[model samples]
Target: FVNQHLCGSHLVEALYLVCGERGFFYTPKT
Candidate 1:
């Protein structure tokens, strides 16, 4: 559902989505 800002890969997005859904990994950028 998303793409990495640099590599343009779904791995990062996928990870974030799963982590975000699991409610264990939250990394907010400034």
Candidate 2:
């Protein structure tokens, strides 16, 4: 249970960072 929880937390954080960094598809990196 504990392991699963940590994995889920990490995945959630990754998605959040990826989503936020894209500026909700408004800004570009290049």
Candidate 3:
């Protein structure tokens, strides 16, 4: 259950970042 929650949370964040909102608090170093 805990793992599932983390997985969803990560998915949302990734989508948001790739959606062009990565300037909020993230910067890709690669």
Candidate 4:
């Protein structure tokens, strides 16, 4: 169940990023 949820969440995040929406917050490496 947890794995399934994670998969779905990942998919949604990927779609959001692909659509140019803010998906996951990332820190820039300096």
What order do you get sorting by TM-score, best first?
2, 4, 3, 1
lDDT of residue 11 for candidate 4? 66
Best by TM-score: 2
lDDT of 1: 0.54
> What are the RMSD figures for all models against the true structure?
7.0, 9.4, 7.1, 7.2
Q: In order, how many clashes per candidate?
A: 0, 0, 0, 0
lDDT of 1 by residue, 1-30 (tens): 655453334546666767875655424551
Query: Highest lDDT, which number?
Result: 1
lDDT of 2 by residue, 1-30 (tens): 133343455765755766885644322233
In terms of lDDT, model 2 sits at 0.51
Q: Which stretches of candidate 2 lie over 4 Å from their true place?
A: 1-6, 21-30
- Give lDDT tens digits, candidate 4, residues 1-30: 133343456765655656664555433342
Query: What lDDT score goes with residue 30 in model 4?
Result: 20
Candidate 3 lDDT (Cα, 0 to 1):
0.52
Better of 1 and 3 by lDDT: 1
**Model 1, runs deviating above 4 Å:** 1-8, 21-30
